[PDB]
RNA sequence: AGGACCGAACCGACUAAUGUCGAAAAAUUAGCGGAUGACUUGUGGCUGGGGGUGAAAGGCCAAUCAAACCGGGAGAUAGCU
RNA sequence: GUUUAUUAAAAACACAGCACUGUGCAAACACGAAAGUGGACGUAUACGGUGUGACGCCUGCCCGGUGCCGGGAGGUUAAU
RNA sequence: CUUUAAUGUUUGAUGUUCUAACGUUGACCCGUAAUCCGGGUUGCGGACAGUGUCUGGUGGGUAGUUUGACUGGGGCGGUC
């Protein structure tokens, strides 16, 4: 649900919250937790490799099952939980044998639902099937690119891909970016689309909302000096230069895709 | 006025102590230069 | 490069002739597979006598043994029962491990790599023709019928 | 290190004269490649880091002779 | 409930005066701003000089920064005093 | 809210929001002669860069020049 | 010689298939109570990619330097 707060005071005026009543109001499953120390954008050398990253509230990593290797074992959905790491919510799944796992929650998933994995599975949302068994023209999420890898495509909230073509041992996928990718058939995918589709409606409201979300202030190149940035300098907001990255690479319409290795799996580019 | 020098025995030893100097070769060269000069206090220590 | 040949190559196979070959081809294929030996003024003398005719029989016997063993099964047919899906959509794709194991259990004694699948990987249920490459010039035809359970 | 395990080739520094004769320090690297050589003595494959020239000498001279020379040199393959 | 309000500790440093061989190599006195947060603080770590860090002032990096400090090339060179 | 510790606390910087653009994940990009790390145990409702700066009404005309993207007849064009 | 057409030859651009080089930040097993690494098995790519030498283009991202004298101060103008 989307609720807009009353303009009680500045900073709360523009906040738009996304309240999810069916979320679990309690501590998560301790056995599946794992510490996640923040890096602040620093790498092993200790230098800032990625800017505008730092701070934020402490958050624990949840071991989410992406491979879904428990084939032929029906499992019930215990509840849904808030995972700070993903944009989408996660679901606690209890298998018939009595083990609990975390999975991405699609739109149609809710407590008390039944899910299954492997070829011997129905077509209900949330089931894990290989594309060869999935009918063409359907919506799937958490797609794999190589068998057993785990799934990398369509993992964010409200994301999905289409089965557009089936060329024998290969399948063509149309991604939310308008990209048509050729993928090997045997590797797995999950039916339905990721839940929490209203992630756009949130606006964070104020400056500090981004601050405790792990994001640091961004400094425009113009405000910088000539030495530290290619932009900057001059009296009175002078630019007179083509936009560029801080390291001289020309941005704003310069393709940086140079792989020559995965191009054989690319059918069409973005448009 | 918080001056620059804020003493701390632990940090002083872990930054300029004997074991810190010997860990890396350059510190080893520093000890060698001190010995050649014949300084009474080779390094910092209690 | 000059190299003496032991096996019969389809294109340049003449059992020990000084035919130029690419160095990479010899290093990657001929040498590891024992189909050739690097002869440079030294192995030539040994080949003229110890291998010019002696090794010919030692090489033909293997071809004869393969020919007799690969006709062990007079029926020349394979039947496997699979729990295929309703109206097609076989349970899961099957490669060569299953058929090779079944053939070994009841049929011809064959290795794993010896099996070749020219027509896909036998996905659709029904009768299919499979070719086995047992020798450089010997081809074997086998009929495989998958029965839905 | 970028050192051939057969011929001992190592990177060698040098200058790159420009059209205006300007000199800048460069470095010529050997054409090293990781290759897997089949040896019948052990009936197994041994991985080596060799250059294009190194692979030629292995191709000409016996693989065993190169290994024996390599063992004498004291380098572990 | 609140980067909500008034206001001590705490953090900050807008105005004036004093002080400029001062008590102090930026302080005191009287007012002033924030004060549940993008807050503040202790301890210990990480980032090393054509580099770091920077809510961006060429600011900060041991009272020194449009390129730190120490030693060396080095008795650099000085058509200048 | 932040800033020129030690003459400038501001109209400057940041800001939520908006737009453009790059990136299909061995991602772009960054630090590294390299390995390897960060990005991220994230994967397009995500991430980087750039500009603008809540919100309201809007954001017009011009592709010559300089960039960027795409095309390809012909010309020119290194090593070899 | 102008003008044609078989077989064999030097072949090179182009396309298809294969795997044994090579890639694998795919899976499984072992060293090994090990997310490194190595080996083995297998899958997927595959003579591409990637790397070395040579070479064209791009290249203030970075570096070393230059940017005259006369002159009723200098600059501008003019002059040599």
Residue at token pair 């910092």: B44
Task: Please tell me whether residues A108 and A5 are part of one structural domain.
Answer: yes
Look-up of token digits 């010899």 = C26
- Which nucleotide C1' is nearest C24 CA? G21
- Residues in CB range of A261: below 8 A, 6 or more apart: none
CB atoms inside a 10 Å sphere around CB A91: 26
Distance from CA of C118 to the nearest CA of A (A): 14
Domain boundary among A137, A167, A194: A194
Q: What's the rounded Cα separation, in Å, for the pair C144 and D44?
A: 37
CATH number at residue A251: 4.10.950.10
Q: Is C56 helix (H, G, I), strand (E, B) or coil?
A: helix
Q: Can you tell me the distance from the alpha carbon of A38 to that of A59, in angstroms, rounded to the nearest whole number?
A: 9
| Helices of type H across B1-46 | 9-16, 18-23, 25-37
Instruction: Name the nt closest to B15 by C-alpha to C1'.
Output: E45
| DSSP, residue by residue, C89-139 | --SS---SHHHHHHHHHSS----STT---SSTTS-SSSEEEEEEE-SSS-E
Other beta carbons less than 10 A from residue C140's beta carbon: 20
Q: What is the CA radius of gyration of chain B?
A: 12
Q: Are A174 and A180 in contact (CB under 8 A)?
A: yes
CA–CA distance, A213 with A215 (Å, rounded to integer): 6
| Calpha distance C89→A263 (Å, rounded) | 31
Q: Are residues A9 and A106 in the same domain?
A: yes
Nucleotides on chain G within 7 angstroms of protein Cβ: 20-23, 26-28, 38-40, 42-54, 60-61
- Total number of domains in chain A: 3
DSSP state of A147: T
Question: Class assignment of domain D1-77?
Answer: mainly beta
Contact flag, residue A253 CB and nucleic strand F, below 7 A: yes
Tell me whether residues A132 and C91 touch, CB distance under 8 A.
no
How far apart are the C-alpha atoms of A143 and A5, rounded to whole Å?
37
Range of the domain at A249: 195-271
CATH of the domain at A15: 2.40.50.140
Query: Would you give the DSSP letter of residue A14?
Result: S
Spatial distance between the Cα atoms of A149 and A230, rounded to a whole number of angstroms: 41
Q: Which chains touch B (3 or more CB pairs under 8 A)?
A: none
> Which residue range(s) make up the domain with C121?
69-148
Q: Which two tokens stand for residue C71?
A: 């006709």
Tell me how far apart the alpha carbons of residues A249 and C99 are, in angstroms, rounded to a whole number: 56
- Distances in Å between the alpha carbon of A117 and those of A130, A187, A190, C120? 9, 13, 9, 26
C-alpha closest to that of A201 among A35, A16, A39? A16
Architecture of domain B1-46: Orthogonal Bundle (1.10)
Domain of C93, CATH number, reads: 3.10.430.100
Nucleic strand F under 7 Å from the C-beta of A174: no
d(CA A16, CA C46): 89
Distances (CA, A) of C115 to A162, A240, C14, C122, C144: 36, 69, 27, 13, 13
A132 and C93: CB-CB below 8 Å?
A: yes
**Solved using:** cryo-EM
């Amino acid at each position: 649900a989307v609720v807009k707060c009353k303009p009680t005071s500045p900073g709360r005026r523009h906040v738009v919250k996304v309240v999810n009543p069916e979320l679990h109001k309690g501590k998560p499953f301790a056995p599946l937790l794992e510490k996640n120390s923040k890096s602040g954008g620093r790498n092993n050398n200790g230098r800032i490799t990625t800017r505008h990253i730092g701070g934020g509230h402490k958050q624990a990593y949840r071991i989410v099952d992406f491979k879904r290797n428990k084939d032929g074992i029906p499992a019930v959905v215990e509840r849904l939980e808030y995972d700070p790491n993903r944009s989408a919510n996660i679901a606690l799944v209890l298998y018939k044998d009595g083990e609990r796992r975390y999975i991405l929650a699609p739109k149609g998933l809710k407590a008390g639902d039944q899910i299954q994995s492997g070829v011997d599975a129905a077509i209900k949302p949330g089931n894990t099937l290989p594309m060869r068994n999935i009918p063409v023209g359907s919506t799937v999420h958490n797609v794999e690119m190589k068998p057993g890898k785990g799934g990398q495509l369509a993992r964010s909230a409200g994301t999905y891909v289409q089965i557009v073509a089936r060329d024998g041992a290969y399948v063509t996928l149309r991604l939310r970016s308008g990209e048509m990718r050729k993928v090997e058939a045997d590797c797995r995918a999950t039916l339905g689309e990721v839940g929490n589709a209203e992630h756009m409606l949130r606006v964070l409201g104020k400056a500090g909302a981004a601050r405790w979300r792990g994001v640091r202030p961004t400094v425009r190149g113009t405000a910088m000096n000539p030495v530290d940035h290619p932009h900057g300098g001059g009296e009175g907001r002078n630019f007179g230069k083509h936009p560029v990255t801080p390291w001289g690479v020309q941005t704003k319409g310069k393709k940086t895709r140079s792989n020559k290795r995965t191009d054989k799996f690319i059918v069409r580019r973005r448009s | 006025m918080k001056r620059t020098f804020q003493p701390s025995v632990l940090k002083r030893n872990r930054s300029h102590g004997f074991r810190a100097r010997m860990a890396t070769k350059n510190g080893r060269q520093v000890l060698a230069r001190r010995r050649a000069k014949g300084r009474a206090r080779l390094t910092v220590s209690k | 490069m000059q190299v003496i040949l032991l096996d019969k190559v389809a294109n340049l196979g003449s059992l020990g002739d000084q035919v130029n070959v690419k160095a990479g081809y010899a290093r990657n294929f001929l040498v590891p597979q024992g189909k050739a030996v690097p002869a440079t003024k030294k192995n030539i003398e040994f080949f003229e006598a110890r291998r010019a005719e002696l090794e010919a029989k030692l090489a033909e016997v293997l071809a004869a043994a393969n020919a007799r063993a690969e006709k062990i099964n007079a029926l020349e047919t394979v039947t496997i029962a699979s729990k295929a899906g309703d109206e097609g959509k076989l349970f899961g794709s099957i490669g060569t491990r299953d058929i090779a194991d079944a053939v070994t259990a009841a049929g011809v004694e064959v290795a794993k790599s010896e099996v070749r699948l020219p027509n896909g990987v036998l996905r659709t249920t029904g009768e299919h023709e499979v070719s086995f490459q047992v020798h450089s010039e010997v081809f074997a035809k086998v009929i495989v019928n998958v029965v839905a359970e | 290190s970028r050192v051939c395990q057969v011929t001992g080739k190592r990177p060698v520094t040098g200058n790159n004269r420009s059209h205006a004769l300007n000199a800048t320090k460069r470095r010529f690297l050997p054409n090293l490649h990781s290759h897997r050589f089949w040896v019948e003595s052990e009936k197994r494959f041994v991985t080596l880091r060799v250059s294009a020239k190194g692979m030629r000498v292995i191709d000409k001279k016996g693989i065993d002779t190169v290994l024996a020379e390599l063992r004498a040199r004291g380098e572990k393959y």
